[PDB]
């Protein structure tokens, strides 16, 4: 007993998405993909900072980025490849006095549901935060091992039953429970309207710097890989007072709301893995949450 957790214990990320490159298409002209360019407009304004009152007279020529659709294409296309990898129970930096006990404590994990919610967050449009808002038509095409799947009307908040997501979830759960990998090429086509302004992900700017950096690969608007990884693991409906699916965190913590849902109420990942290697009976939902964290990965040492 009293199997104390290793200080070096970490797990690798098992859902690896690429950067979500963003293109402009039409709804019936889906093959002509023109890359959405981040424009950048200059704004003239004096600097106002707390530490330098002497520098407020002149300076701060700032040039803020923006990204709209072109005025001939009404559909935004978002392309990214989500790579699910198996052996989520292998610790990369941990070892096997604790990670092997985790293997033999989370073998009864229903990966079917875990994978369903992953592919449902892929398909329903959780990966399209501010640009699925106000779109009159949502479409998702998933290409997986030469199989094409079409999704039109999936409400993203609840994980309802559709056999299309389920079909992919099968091979995704077979990867995650076993050994190997699977790759889902996900292209989202959302009809926002003619010249509607799109929403790339944001680089962190300083309190000063410029107003807003949109995410650029080679000049073209895109969204962060870790931001999509936040979308995919947004499956946590099993904490106490669970209203909406949150991103599976080791503490159940969302930064933008200023509260942590699983911290400080004995449902955090660390107490559940210590309970697993000390062998108390877990329910299915918290064990699924622990396996979702191990799929997410991260260093758990102290």
């Amino acid at each position: 007993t009293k199997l104390k957790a290793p200080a070096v214990l970490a797990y690798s990320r098992k859902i690896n998405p690429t950067n979500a490159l963003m293109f402009a298409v039409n709804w019936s002209d889906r093959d002509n993909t023109t890359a959405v360019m981040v424009g950048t407009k200059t704004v003239a304004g004096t600097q106002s900072v707390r530490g330098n009152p002497n520098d407020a007279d002149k300076g701060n020529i700032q040039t803020v980025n923006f990204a709209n659709l072109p005025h001939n294409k009404n559909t935004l296309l978002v392309k990214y490849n989500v790579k699910f990898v198996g052996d989520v129970f292998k610790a990369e930096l941990g070892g096997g006095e604790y990670s092997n006990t985790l293997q033999t404590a989370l073998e009864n994990t229903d990966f079917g549901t875990l994978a369903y919610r992953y592919v449902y967050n892929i398909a329903a449009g959780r990966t399209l935060w501010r640009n699925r808002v106000g779109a009159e038509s949502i479409e998702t095409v998933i290409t997986v091992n030469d199989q094409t799947f079409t999704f039109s009307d999936l409400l993203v908040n609840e994980f309802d039953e559709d056999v299309d997501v389920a079909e992919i979830a099968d091979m995704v759960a077979g990867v995650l429970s076993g050994e190997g990998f699977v790759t889902l090429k996900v292209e989202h086509y959302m009809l926002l309207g003619e010249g509607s302004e799109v929403f790339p992900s944001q680089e962190f700017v300083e309190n000063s710097k410029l107003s807003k950096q949109l995410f650029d690969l080679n000049g073209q608007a895109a969204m962060h890989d870790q931001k999509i990884g936040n979308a995919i693991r947004t499956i946590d409906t099993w904490y106490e007072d669970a209203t909406t699916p949150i991103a599976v965190e080791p503490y159940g913590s969302v930064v933008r709301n200023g509260v942590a849902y699983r911290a400080g109420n004995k449902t955090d990942l660390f107490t559940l893995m210590d309970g697993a290697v000390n062998g108390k009976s877990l329910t299915e939902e918290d064990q699924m949450f622990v396996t979702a964290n191990l799929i997410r990965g991260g260093v758990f040492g102290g």
Binding site: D160, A242, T283, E285
Partner: protein, 295 residues
């Protein structure tokens, strides 16, 4: 005054208020507030209730119990009973626990019927929601409420353990709380300690729900120590489990309407007992417990 409550099929839970029950000319009657005596037929009633302002005498008690009319003492309203004896198979010929009671015990014991009955109590809680449709409350056929209902139905049907059912029950209950908060334009978070109108009105409505569920559990002889969802150490957990069926279907819309219009507590009590009398909510709980225990 004189109040009739249908409970199972034919026997009636009589509620007597502001009256003196005694024996006149060899049979049980009661003098009322208006100075007019009213008799009681022994054949059509089994439960007779004594509300506020009511006294009964000894030979009236004895002759009522010798006619199979088993008496209980309740707070005025008929659904806040504090004193009774236990239903038997017959009141005079023998002393055996009721078939319903024994069935409940057996079902509770074997782990599979306990899990199946926990799933079933939540199935009938969703049924209660639709069955008892209010006017001021949210639409049960609305897309958000139906999505919450189907989420609860999927979660109960796919669960194999009780703590999963507790998490899903809490999700459904507070999701209906969130829906009714979205109706009535307020930030509502369920806490018993708050002194606002919505929380304390829901609290005393929940206490009324506990009272009517206690009456429904007593009326089939079901004891207060076999909860389905709640733990074995929870005192009176079966009252809470049965009252859960009508907490989010009846008590929650009435309480949110009561806090919206802001009237006082006694007229919320009369609205709750009016909804209990009009739609036969106790009879619904009685048939619910029969279908649960009979299986």
């Amino acid at each position: 005054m004189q109040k009739q409550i249908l409970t199972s099929q034919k026997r009636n839970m009589y509620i007597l208020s502001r009256c003196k029950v005694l024996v006149k000319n060899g049979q049980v009657c009661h003098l009322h507030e208006d100075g007019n005596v009213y008799t009681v037929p022994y054949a059509n009633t089994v439960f007779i209730g004594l509300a506020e302002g009511t006294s009964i005498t000894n030979e009236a008690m004895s002759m009522l119990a010798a006619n199979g009319v088993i008496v209980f003492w309740t707070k005025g309203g008929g659904y806040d009973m504090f004193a009774a004896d236990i239903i038997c198979h017959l009141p005079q010929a023998d002393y055996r626990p009721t078939k319903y009671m024994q069935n409940w015990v057996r079902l509770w014991l074997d782990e599979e019927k306990k899990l199946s009955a926990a799933k079933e109590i939540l199935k009938m809680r969703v049924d209660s929601l639709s069955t008892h449709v209010h006017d001021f409350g949210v639409d049960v056929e609305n897309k958000r409420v139906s999505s919450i209902v189907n989420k609860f139905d999927k979660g109960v049907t796919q669960a194999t353990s009780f703590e999963s059912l507790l998490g899903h029950e809490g999700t459904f209950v507070k999701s209906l709380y969130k829906e009714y908060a979205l109706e009535y334009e307020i930030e509502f978070k369920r806490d018993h300690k708050s002194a606002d109108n919505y929380n304390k009105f829901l609290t005393l409505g929940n206490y009324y729900a506990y009272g009517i569920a206690r009456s429904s559990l007593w009326a089939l002889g079901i004891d207060n120590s076999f909860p389905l969802l709640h733990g074995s150490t929870r005192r009176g957990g079966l009252v809470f489990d049965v009252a859960d069926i009508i907490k989010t279907s009846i008590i929650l819309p009435l309480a949110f309407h009561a806090a919206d219009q802001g009237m006082s507590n006694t007229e919320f009590k009369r609205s709750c007992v009016a909804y209990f009398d009009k739609n036969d909510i106790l009879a619904y709980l009685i048939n619910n417990i029969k279908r649960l225990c009979m299986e």
